[PDB]
Design a protein around this nucleic acid. Structure first.
Lengths: 88, 129
RNA sequence: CUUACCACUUUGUGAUUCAUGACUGGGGUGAAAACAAGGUAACCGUAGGGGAACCUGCGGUUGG
RNA sequence: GUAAAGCGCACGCAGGCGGUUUGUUAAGUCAGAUGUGAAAUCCCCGGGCUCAACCUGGGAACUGCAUCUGAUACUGGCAAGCUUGAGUCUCGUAGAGGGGGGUAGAAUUCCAGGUGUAGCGGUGAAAUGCGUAGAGAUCUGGAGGAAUACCGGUGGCGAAGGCGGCCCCCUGGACGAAGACUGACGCUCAGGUGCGAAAGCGUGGGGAGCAAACAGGAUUAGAUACCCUGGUAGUCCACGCCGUAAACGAUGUCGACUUGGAGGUUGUGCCCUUGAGGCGUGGCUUCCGGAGCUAACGCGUUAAGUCGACCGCCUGGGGAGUAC
RNA sequence: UAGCUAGUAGGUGGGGUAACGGCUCACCUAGGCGACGAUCCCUAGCUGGUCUGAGAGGAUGACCAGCCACACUGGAACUGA
């Protein structure tokens, strides 16, 4: 649902260059933008459950990517979890 | 394959033999090539050949005496879930010596006869027969 | 002689069992037609009526 | 699968398992050594009892444990990669996927009126209940709720439950084509968490039809049969609870490999650059059947084949999914 | 049987002991153990061995040998290598 322009902005603003779509920082930033917006969605309706499932996939996959960063490179991970505001 | 690529290669061999296929292929590893060496020097296959640089592919060539495949059984023994290691005095005779066990010794991957000769055991990869 | 500790002992308070107890729980005992086409398939969950086992509602299954 | 046995369905922590190439280490592993593994017992060869049992000599065995030295294929570790798994991206397609928001008719009953007077009603049979006080039907408007006939399906989407009027808003997932990016980021999961038909519950409403209960008649061997006539909970909405089904493909999830034929649905490439087309090529899906497997029935590339990872489960029938 | 534990876990000093040690004490710290099963309940002497079994295993631990523990029950010490 998240617009193409927003994905381009995020890929730029967390990517190591332009069109590095697939690095963990890029992946996590897209997932966190989507989490925030959907949490906007489900605030108003709490009784959508088939869509909320896709949101649990987003959250779970984002935890898995963040755990991969922490294991691989701690420095980029710690820069990210606040440079994007995470592990609150 | 996903977790046991060596049972993958044996499954391919016995499935291709029961399918009367002339050659099977699979993504190569260096231990796949080692076991293939053991087999083709024991006369269980004709040949093999690894092509590709970033994606090598191991090209086993199956072998039929007439219309019957040379391998009757080929069973994985040590798997992820049970690793099997034998001391050289307890290396297994496979079909009373008529079939091999390929073991992984610390001097490489050899047959069972070769290992009990050189007085060193190791991890039992499979039973061929 | 007197402190410190303490086994046992007495009390209370607790837990835990043992027996037995009306009762249970009434298991009773004795006393006041159709064989998937066949008085209305075979089932599953649930809720009702009533001595129940049955029947009915609601959803479901083919193992009719 | 059906004999007992795949949790209703996911997601997921611990845990288990882990593509590929170097390097390293040397934990597992392997090898050698050494020390220890009491004696007896057991086993082998002997010896003594007249033989045997029994006794006894020597040996072997004690399948183990530790330590040292070595090996380094494999597993582990540590390091560094790789790109095939997994993912991110870009663009489109189909869809009863979901939550909302209004939306319209068919049918539905009464009223609002006339039009009409001997009927309305039903079973094994009446009858009970309506009506001549105007009863039904007609058109007329209303009221209000339920549900969306055709399309419609061998269809589709969803983890499963399940989803079907039209239209908008929000939203989820899937798939296809090339390309880019990451760089094993994976699979499975006890516990846990969440979803979960129907009935039911609780709290407020709503109540057009229906309909357990209950209320009339007749039952039948007696009737609290069956039935028909009304009919309340409920059904519907909001929130909370329940957490169960033959929740079923009675078939856990994931990956790989193994002959065919007949379809359906949805993409897409080449060439007919006519719309299909002819030839591909994907995803889903229905049905035959080969090997194989199966007790058989059957399954059969969507496997119940051949394998690998992890989980759940079973262990004669009843007692009993019961008691505590 | 899912939490258990205040010499509880550790530390400094005293003390004590043949000896190390929370062994004990004073103070300090606030730990330690537990889903690789703590705690709690139940059962049980342990082993070489024995029996059974092709084996893997099961079942046992009478005799004999080794180790433990006990000596009416519960406390306690003394003497002494």
């Amino acid at each position: 649902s998240l617009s193409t322009e927003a994905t381009a902005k995020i890929v730029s603003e967390f990517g190591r260059d332009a069109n590095d779509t697939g690095s963990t920082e890029v992946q996590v930033a897209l997932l966190t933008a989507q989490i925030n917006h959907l949490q906007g969605h489900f605030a108003e309706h709490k009784k959508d459950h088939h869509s909320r499932r896709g949101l649990l996939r987003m959250v779970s996959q984002r935890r898995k990517l963040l755990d991969y960063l922490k294991r691989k490179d701690v420095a980029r991970y710690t820069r990210l979890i606040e440079r994007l505001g995470l592990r609150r | 394959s996903m977790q046991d690529p060596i049972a993958d290669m044996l499954t391919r061999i016995r499935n291709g033999q029961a399918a009367n296929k002339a050659a099977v292929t699979m993504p190569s590893s260096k231990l796949k090539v080692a076991i293939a060496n053991v087999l083709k020097e024991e006369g269980f296959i004709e040949d093999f050949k690894v092509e590709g640089d970033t994606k090598p592919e191991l090209e086993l060539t199956l072998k039929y005496f007439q219309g019957k495949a040379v391998v009757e059984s080929i069973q994985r023994v040590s798997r992820p879930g049970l690793r099997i290691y034998k001391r050289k005095d307890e290396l297994p005779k496979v079909m009373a010596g008529l079939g091999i066990a390929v073991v992984s010794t610390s001097k490489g991957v050899m047959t069972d006869r070769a290992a009990r000769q050189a007085g060193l055991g190791g991890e039992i990869i499979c039973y061929v027969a």
